[PDB]
């Protein structure tokens, strides 16, 4: 396990824009592929987004694709999700972790792929 | 002075076929009869020469290459043969002079929950030529679209986790798999067969 | 082009023997191996005999090693399994195959040249 920290979380209009932020110290992310989930109140943990330890790919669910954005600094110890559009239906606790597991297919990625679970921080979307 | 086959056989882990090792071998007498007669290897296959005409002979440099695979998968390490391991992973030339070597590793190499640290490539834009070694980790653009740093529809990693579990089936099973390849150069033929020493 | 002819099967009592003959045309040379695979009520091909033909070399499994004994007679280019001491596990269509190698596979997929099977039947 490592430390993962994880920041941004809050309030926010529908249509509005948040980043969360993803922070490990030295190679963690240019070591193991990171995702990010979200889990609405009695509902499961579901895939959000995530980028390759490469910091040359990224891979989006279908609900967010094209609304949201990841990204890793140049250092590469702190990956970013761009949260642009949202709708009611983002509101949810999110989380950041990272995986060991290689999968070709990201759509396949499933949160018992993944440890070194962040804080969860709560997104609200007001309509 | 016998070739240390022990390094390359006994190693306690093994390369992922994508990133497949090789090992130089010199300066020593290798049995190559012993390791064929040998009980722990369920494959040996050799082409362009066979165990007995090896242990007549001398070379500069044998290459023992080692990697791991399913079980299913075996069939693909020989000259001419198809399929992702052949095509994408590790390539034998059609003219292959050498030795394919492979043992079931269920015992070594699968554990509960899965073993996800043998990877190999799904999807490459070419086939490898012979003996090349791609570790390369772009997205794979399977269309005409470009994929610009976003996987999706035709946009795929390209290597995939085995995820090797005891109870598998044995045609997804881990198998170590050792090829051996012979080298003559304008220097001393160091490596011999018992008969040619 | 290449051809394996399958012969010699049938039904024997327990402690009896059989001789199982794999005859190999279309073969330029003999840089090639034989396999026997046995396919048992409900179970996969598995091998239990192995020759590589320029080397002479035979294998066997464990279970058939003193009973079973694999050859060769140039003349007419015939690979014999001499099956001594059946069991009535032995009970088998067995198959002869060959691949363009110096020895041997566990792995059917690796052969590329079959017999159709003889049909071996142990039992009282
Ligand atoms: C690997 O180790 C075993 C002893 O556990 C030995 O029998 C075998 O010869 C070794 N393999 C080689 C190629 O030295
Ligand atoms: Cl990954």
Redesign the interface.
């Given at each position: 396990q490592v430390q993962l920290v994880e920041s941004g979380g809050g309030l926010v209009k529908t249509g509005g824009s948040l980043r969360l932020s993803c922070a490990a110290s030295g190679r963690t992310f240019s070591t193991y592929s990171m995702g990010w989930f979200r889990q609405a109140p009695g509902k499961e943990r579901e895939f959000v987004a995530g980028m390759?330890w490469?910091g040359?790919?990224?891979?989006?669910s279908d609900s967010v694709?094209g609304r949201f954005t990841v990204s890793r600094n140049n250092a590469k110890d702190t990956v970013y999700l761009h949260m642009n559009s949202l709708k009611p239906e983002d509101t949810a606790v999110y989380y950041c972790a990272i995986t060991?597991?290689?999968?070709?297919?990201?759509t396949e990625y499933t949160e018992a792929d993944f440890g070194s679970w962040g804080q969860g921080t709560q997104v609200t979307v007001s309509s | 002075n016998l070739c240390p086959f022990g390094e390359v056989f006994n190693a306690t882990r093994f390369a992922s076929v994508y990133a497949w090792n090789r090992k130089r071998i010199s300066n020593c007498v290798a049995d190559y009869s012993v390791l064929?007669?040998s009980?722990s290897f369920?494959?040996?296959?050799?082409?362009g020469?066979?165990?007995?005409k090896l242990n007549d002979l001398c070379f500069t440099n044998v290459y023992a290459d080692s990697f791991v695979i399913r079980?299913?998968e075996?069939?693909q390490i020989?000259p001419g043969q198809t399929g992702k391991i052949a095509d994408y992973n590790y390539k034998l030339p059609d003219d292959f002079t050498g030795?394919v070597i492979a043992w079931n590793s269920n015992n070594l190499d699968s554990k509960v929950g899965?073993n996800?640290?043998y990877?190999y490539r799904?999807?490459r834009k070419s086939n490898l030529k012979p003996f090349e070694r791609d570790i390369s980790?772009?997205?794979y653009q399977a269309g005409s679209t470009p994929?610009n740093?976003?996987?999706?529809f035709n946009c795929?990693?390209?290597?995939?986790?085995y995820?090797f579990q005891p109870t598998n089936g044995v045609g997804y099973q881990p198998y170590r798999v050792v090829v051996l390849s012979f080298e003559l150069l304008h220097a001393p033929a160091t490596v011999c067969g018992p008969k040619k020493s | 082009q290449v051809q394996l002819v399958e012969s010699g099967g049938g039904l024997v009592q327990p402690g009896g023997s059989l001789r199982l003959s794999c005859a190999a045309s279309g073969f330029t040379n003999d840089?090639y191996?034989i396999a026997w695979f046995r396919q048992a009520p409900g179970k996969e091909r598995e091998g239990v005999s192995w020759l590589?033909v320029?080397?002479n070399?035979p294998?066997y499994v464990?279970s058939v090693k003193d009973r079973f004994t694999i050859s060769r007679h140039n003349a007419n280019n015939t690979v014999y399994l001499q099956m001594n001491m059946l069991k009535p596990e032995d009970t088998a269509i067995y198959y002869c195959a060959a691949?363009?190698?110096?020895?041997?596979?566990?792995?059917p997929?690796?052969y590329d040249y079959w017999g159709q099977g003889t049909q071996v039947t142990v039992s009282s």
């Open positions: 390759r490469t040359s790919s990224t891979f989006y694709k060991t597991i290689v999968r070709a297919y990201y | 064929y007669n009980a369920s494959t040996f296959k050799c082409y020469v066979s165990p007995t079980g299913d075996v069939r020989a030795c899965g996800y640290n990877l799904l999807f980790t772009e997205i994929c740093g976003v996987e999706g795929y990693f390209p290597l995939q986790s995820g | 840089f191996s590589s320029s080397d070399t294998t464990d691949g363009r190698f110096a020895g041997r596979d566990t792995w997929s690796s």
